[PDB]
Amino acid sequence: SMVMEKPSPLLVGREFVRQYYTLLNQAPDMLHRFYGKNSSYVHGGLDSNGKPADAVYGQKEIHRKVMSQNFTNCHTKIRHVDAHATLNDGVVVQVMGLLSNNNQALRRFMQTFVLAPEGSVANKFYVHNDIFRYQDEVF
């Protein structure tokens, strides 16, 4: 039946971004599966000092943190996506859009991903890196 699509950096970035924000919205308790043992995650926050928050590693830690940011009916407008080939056939993705959570206000986000080859299955990738910052928190 259907022959496989080539892993075009832009196609991998576009396909991964629709899943990411679809599953964030419809099922954030699953969002931990995009990630691996090694993976790195940070998603806004202003720690006690009032500065941007620290990051965590691996599925369990990431899940922990995802469940702690209670995502209810989280809507996403995505206003641009850039995806480039990076090391070891990995794809680096720059995402700019707005995220409203719990029908609170649509805040603008800057967000870097790195998708890595998964090694076992063709056209399969894992989210090595997930840097998400809100702009109001920084400017």
Binding site: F16, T22, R33, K60, H63, L115, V121, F125, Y126
Partner: peptide
Amino acid sequence: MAQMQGPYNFIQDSMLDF
């Protein structure tokens, strides 16, 4: 999980031990 159908697969096993 029909929407997660695409040309490339990003969804892994759950290392969540229990």
